[PDB]
Design a protein around this ligand. Sequence first.
Ligand code: 1HG
Ligand code: NA
Ligand code: NA
Length: 368
Amino acid sequence: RGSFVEMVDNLRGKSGQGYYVEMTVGSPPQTLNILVDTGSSNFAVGAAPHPFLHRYYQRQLSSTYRDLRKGVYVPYTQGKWEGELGTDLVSIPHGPNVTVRANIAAITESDKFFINGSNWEGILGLAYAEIARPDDSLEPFFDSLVKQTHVPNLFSLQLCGSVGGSMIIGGIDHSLYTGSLWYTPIRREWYYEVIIVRVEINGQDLKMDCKEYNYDKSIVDSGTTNLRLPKKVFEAAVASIKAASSTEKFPDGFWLGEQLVCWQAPWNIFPVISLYLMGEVTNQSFRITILPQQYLRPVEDCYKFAISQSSTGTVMGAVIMEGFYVVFDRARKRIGFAVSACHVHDEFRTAAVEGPFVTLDMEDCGYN
Ligand SMILES: C[C@]1(c2cc(NC(=O)c3ccc(C#N)cn3)ccc2F)N=C(N)O[C@H](C(F)(F)F)[C@@H]1F
Ligand code: NA
Ligand code: NA
């Protein structure tokens, strides 16, 4: 409760490749770097010598592996993986001092899944059983951790935008954030779905039916880079950001993430984005505010516009999370946000989490 020195700084990454944590699977333990992903629910690890991989799970070396004699096939818009289901013993060396028997999908075939040049070999899906594959009977890693140990049912993430950060399993570390935590209800335990109730660009409202913000869902997802916005909201958001900054002109492809843009060694024209999220109390909300620093990503002085359009709803990816300490408070069905002690900023403006605000009709903002 409160202080977890052994877990601080337990994430690494490369800009553009996500954040991963060291884990061990089997007996004797096999060390693997595993992508932290709050927008999926399978613990899926490379188990065959794909050329992009530094290492992979060799089930044959493990005395504690149990075969579930069941295959899984998992396609996405981009690519897919297939593998074999089983269970084995898992630890997190820079996490709690416990070992749990967990489901593992040993990935035996993949396309456009693994990143060439990255340092991770699997994915730790931290969301709920409802979106596990093949079906909701394949219990996720975190539910196994909680069922088999005294670890409380919550974890928190500080993603520092090369990259690093902290995954605190079982608690909150107060050194990772400043000011207060504000909480939004997890609307349904599948993804970490939340409800956005207002959006402002430099404190001007987009003024849309708030149902549009959440069409068909909004989620918090450390396994995606961009702030992704429903097409209609995305149209409104860039129209308003373009206008906000038109002191400078940029090729239009830029706004679609189709070309990059460059300077040397300009931020103050770019506006802040405020998302107000449904609060814990009736008619109460709070707001989180991000900086151009989060939505303009460095590529290597050339940046990518990292807000993009979506047909799967809003996705608050690593772009949003890197401003904030984010507490995934599963025991109470709520996600807390606070200003991260490590967020990328400047002398003028800071990322911010403020409340309470009075917002009426917040349940209308949910899509059904
Ligand atoms: C399972 C999945 C996934 C994520 C990544 N993520 C990354 O490669 C990555 C790269 C950079 C950053 C950062 N910052 C974070 N993540 C790669 C493959 C993959 F299948 N997880 C999520 N949430 O969304 C992906 C989707 F549903 F979109 F397909 C997909 F489900
Ligand atoms: Na328990
Ligand atoms: Na603090």
